[model samples]
Target: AATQEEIVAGLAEIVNEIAGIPVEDVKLDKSFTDDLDVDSLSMVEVVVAAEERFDVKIPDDDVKNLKTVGDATKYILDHQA
Candidate 1:
């Protein structure tokens, strides 16, 4: 299991690596596609990586709800391994 900050930090790194954005730029309001121009496939990559990194299950059908960095971060925090 992980704390909210730790989860958010992990998500920031993943997003930065996957989206080619600054980790500091991954805010709660930042959406993968809307804000960073990351495509859907890239987002799927992010979700898959997060699943492995956090040892949590992010179903393919559920990825759409995790539109923002904060959304994914909170999901990880809420369901950490």
Candidate 2:
């Protein structure tokens, strides 16, 4: 079971590792596409990382809105693991 903070941190780490962004740069307020240089391809990559790391499949339903760390965290915390 992953805590909210851990999930957030994990997402940041995965994004950093996969997308080449730094941890310090991955603020909760940072938008993945705008602040973190994450475009559609990178977003897909991050989603893949999240799916594998957290064992959570991001439905096509909310993939667009899950473009930010905060948004994704909420989605995961609000929904299933």
For all predicted structures, in order, the TM-scores are 0.83, 0.81
What local distance difference test score does each model get? 0.77, 0.76
C-alpha positional error of residue 3 in candidate 2 after TM-score superposition, expressed in Å: 2.1
**Candidate achieving the largest lDDT:** 1
lDDT of model 2, residue 70: 82
Best by TM-score: 1
What TM-score number comes out for model 1? 0.83
For model 2, residues 1-81, the per-residue Cα lDDT tens digits are: 568777788788877877778876787777877778866677777887787777788854577887778888888877655
Error of model 2, residue 77, in angstroms: 0.8
Q: Write the per-residue lDDT of candidate 1 for residues 1-81, one digit (tens) a residue.
A: 577667766777887888777777777788877886677777777788888878898986887887887787777777776
TM-score of 2: 0.81
Clashing pairs in 2: none
For candidate 1, the clash count comes to 1
Error of 1 at 71 (Å): 1.6
Off by over 4 Å in 2: none
Q: What's model 2's lDDT at 24?
A: 68
- Residue 14 of model 2 has an lDDT of 79
